Amino acid sequence: QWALEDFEIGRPLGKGKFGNVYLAREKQSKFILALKVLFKAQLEKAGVEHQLRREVEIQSHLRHPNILRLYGYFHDATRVYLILEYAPLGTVYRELQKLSKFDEQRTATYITELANALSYCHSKRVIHRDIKPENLLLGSAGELKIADFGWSVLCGTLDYLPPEMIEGRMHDEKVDLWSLGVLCYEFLVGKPPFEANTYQETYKRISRVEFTFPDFVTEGARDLISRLLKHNPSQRPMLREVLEHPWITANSSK
Template sequence: MNKAKVKRRVGKYEVGRTIGEGTFAKVKFARNAETGEPVALKILDKEKVLKHKMAEQIEREIATMKLIKHPNVIRLYEVMGSKTKIFIVMEFVTGGELFDKIVNHGRMREDEARRYFQQLINAIDYCHSRGVYHRDLKPENLLLDAYGNLKVSDFGFSALSQQVRDDGLLHTSCGTPNYVAPEVLNDRGYDGTTADLWSCGVILFVLLAGYLPFDDSNLMNLYKKISAAEFNCPPWLSFNAMKLITRILDPNPITVSSNTLGKFSQEHHVTEKKEEQPAAMNAFDLISMSKGLNLSNLFDVEQEFKRETRFTSKCPANEIISKIEEAAKPLGFDVHKKNYKMRLENVKAGRKGNLNVATEIFQVAPSLHMVEVRKARGDTLEFHEFYKKLSTCLDDVVWKTGEDMQDMK
């Protein structure tokens, strides 16, 4: 008796063939059964992730991708979990890796390389504006869609601005050796912006030359070449291309033109509209913030003191901002506002430097807002003490349910 093949489903997605496989995950083609839209479904085995201590990296990748919404960055649509698996639903692109294009066709003409480089710079400049540093940029992590547009992927080694230490630098050495910046190798801390820019410069060189600027079978020799920026441009490069590459591949992050990235993005940027109301929060955002689908609960890893907290309010967004400002200033905090985001900075240094607190207001419904309050820098215990004092001052702003009122009796 012939039976119709029943397609496996994960949530609303029909799962198809395997399109990629790694140590900790499989990536399968899937289709949204409601809309017919193709997606890539990354399936992670919880047991393997925990065994190899990859939970933090996966959490970081998901948190990072949720922050980034840009036409040249792979989109994350949804995260789901079961007892044994984590499912990450992402944008599906069909053009393969930029690396394959170089391997199959060799070096590019300057006009073609320029287009990809401009898209890369647009994407990375946008990521930096959101406090996200990729830290593993290479052609293998640059995908192409059906129209040949570049899509930055694989944020597994990315860093958020919260990971910057009190000296203002990142300290984790990561990335692929041939593409990594000299300051990352010297283990004295580095600026994520200039480190990513260096990798962009190496990528531009590869696109135009067809080979790596720094390469050696001996790793120590490779590091020496990178640290000294020891490379030669091929004779077929134009003067302007050579000049740009030389400016970017400067081994001193202090003297490298800090506005090179900005200049490129200004020339070929994706304009952002000024926010006229708080960012809307969809059902997935709410669920992922709840206890039921919090990533830390997916992994069942014991957490330290929370570095962020949230509350809801029925007050208008502008009133919430004014109330937070009124409460924070007497506690010794400078207040910096931009749209519906605020940065509160303690003027006095604490145990780990000046405590910085970031707040953002999201619209859940026309008359309901969620306020996120998180530690951006400083001591976590000091953040908790601050939040206790702040919440006391905001007693009339925080929305209390009937259950909350009952608990207070």
């Protein structure tokens, strides 16, 4: 349906390797979109096409206001182009750099928006597996929007992954609930509960669930995080249960 000459490319958004992402406009509708440009070249040379057609399968047929939209696509046999919803306030990664920490209010608010979106995801049997600030985007009203269902169902940051996954074991939708715990912490503290300087050391830190709270960490948070980051998936809060945590209802600007 679409082709390249359909768009005026604009400002580079991000890099990353996959390829690049550009802001751009549909010539004839004047619509504003994010265009991710992925090279077929390095696509096979690193064998991932199966996860791509599948990111699309999910992200095209999915619909929450807290999930980014794919509109579709096309190719030229050098690259594939994804036609993406554009999130004008950028990454939650960059807000985090910009303010180093977040406050309890913003945080819960993001934890909420993320639980609904995950909740809608898990209703439909889907596990994102890769929610991390760099994949968390922001709408004009400043709402959270999850992107990037690439690794959806050695090598790449361990920080957000739960024991069972990192050890290669049998997992469920409960994994995203560990991520959300790590997320929760990461917002309040400046950096992931399990950070490290190496991947083998982060392997350890995660396997043994070794995290601690800076003094300014309220007990409301200490509780949501302690409960979300239990090694055993059985005893991980349900998504509904999360929305309903005393600390969440008190702080979310829902």
